[PDB]
Each structure stands twice: as C-alpha cells, then as structure tokens.
Amino acid sequence: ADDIVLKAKNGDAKFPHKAHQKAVPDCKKCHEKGPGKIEGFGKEMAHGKGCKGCHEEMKKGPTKCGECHKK
Ligand code: HEC
Ligand code: HEC
Ligand code: HEC
Numbered sequence: 001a002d003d004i005v006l007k008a009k010n011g012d013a014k015f016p017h018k019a020h021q022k023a024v025p026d027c028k029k030c031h032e033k034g035p036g037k038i039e040g041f042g043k044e045m046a047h048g049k050g051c052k053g054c055h056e057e058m059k060k061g062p063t064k065c066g067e068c069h070k071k
C-alpha cells in the first residue's frame, strides 16, 4: 500500500510507513488498537502521542513544525 499524507492546512504531513515499520518493531503501538482510532485522530493526537509525542519518547523522529509540515 501507499504512504498517506494528512492534509493539514498549514502544510501536508506525510507519514512514511517503511521508516516506522523499521524503527518501531512494537507494531502494537499503532496496530490492533480497539475501535475509534480512525475517527479519533486529529491535531491534538498528532501533536501528542499520535505523532510528535512518540518521536519525543523514542528520542527519534521529527519534532519541529517544519519537519512534519511541508507545503
Ligand atoms: C504507527 C506509527 C505504525 C507503526 C509503528 C507500524 N505501522 Fe503499519 N501502518 C500504519 C499506518 C498508518 C498504515 C496505513 C498507511 C500507510 O502508510 O501504509 C500502515 C500500514 C501497514 C501495512 C500495509 C502496508 C503495505 O501494504 O504497504 C502493513 C502490512 C503494516 N502496517 C504492518 C505493520 C507492522 C508488521 C509493523 C511493525 C513492525 C507496523 N506496521 C508498524 C501505522 C503503523
Ligand atoms: C511511535 C509509536 C511513532 C508514532 C506513533 C509516529 N512516529 Fe514517526 N517516527 C518514529 C520513529 C522512531 C522515527 C525515526 C525513523 C528513523 O529511522 O529515523 C520516526 C520517523 C518519522 C519521520 C521521518 C522518517 C525518515 O525517513 O526519517 C516522519 C516524517 C514521521 N515519523 C512522521 C510521523 C507522523 C506524521 C506520525 C503521525 C501520523 C508519526 N510519525 C507517528 C516513531 C513514531
Ligand atoms: C509531526 C511529528 C508534527 C509536528 C512536529 C507538528 N505537527 Fe502539526 N500536525 C501534524 C499532523 C499529522 C497534523 C494533522 C492532524 C489531522 O487532523 O490529521 C497536524 C495538524 C496541525 C494543524 C491543524 C491543521 C488542520 O487542521 O488542517 C496545525 C495548525 C499545525 N499542525 C501546526 C503545527 C505547528 C505550528 C507545529 C510546531 C509548533 C506543529 N504543527 C508540529 C504533525 C505534526
């Protein structure tokens, strides 16, 4: 399947799966979650544990605005 881009108004936020499959061998961090995760994602999640928060916790991945968001 293809990578997806989240259409944030301030700039497209791409999600490259291959890098994540490699750097996050604990697949259950994102997969096999209960229901609601598709409906639940948004800016709050993205800037929290959904994206940015994991990068901070794992000490790796983009944590600056212009690193995730790109027009
Ligand atoms: C969140 C950070 C994820 C982690 C960690 C892993 N996966 Fe993932 N996966 C995630 C998303 C949002 C998507 C759909 C959008 C996309 O970019 O593909 C997927 C997709 C998959 C797929 C389909 C891939 C393909 O057909 O190219 C598979 C088979 C899959 N994910 C499995 C997988 C495994 C085994 C992981 C751990 C090593 C893993 N994913 C991590 C989100 C995230
Ligand atoms: C852990 C559970 C993560 C979640 C949830 C998300 N990301 Fe992530 N990301 C994670 C790690 C450990 C890394 C380092 C990968 C590396 O090998 O350097 C990343 C990396 C990225 C990248 C850059 C990929 C690259 O080729 O350098 C991007 C652009 C990125 N992550 C974006 C991103 C977004 C938008 C997420 C939410 C939708 C997201 N990540 C979740 C760990 C985790
Ligand atoms: C990746 C790790 C991110 C970092 C670092 C920052 N942002 Fe972000 N942001 C990210 C995603 C994946 C999303 C989309 C959420 C969704 O609904 O899918 C967003 C969202 C925003 C928004 C709202 C955009 C909209 O609703 O159209 C804004 C205004 C925004 N982001 C700004 C922003 C700034 C200023 C940041 C640095 C301080 C920043 N983001 C960090 C992913 C990531």
Ligand SMILES: C[C@H](CCC(=O)O)[C@H]1CC[C@H]2[C@@H]3CC[C@@H]4C[C@H](O)CC[C@]4(C)[C@H]3C[C@H](O)[C@]12C
Pocket: 004, 006, 015, 029, 030, 031, 033, 037, 038, 039, 040, 041, 042, 049, 050, 051
């Ligand atoms: C559930 C995990 C991990 C975050 C968490 O613990 O909740 C998060 C990490 C990235 C999230 C995905 C980002 C891209 C998509 C955003 C859409 O608006 C809703 C579906 C997708 C596919 C999201 C589904 C789910 O919300 C994921 C996989």
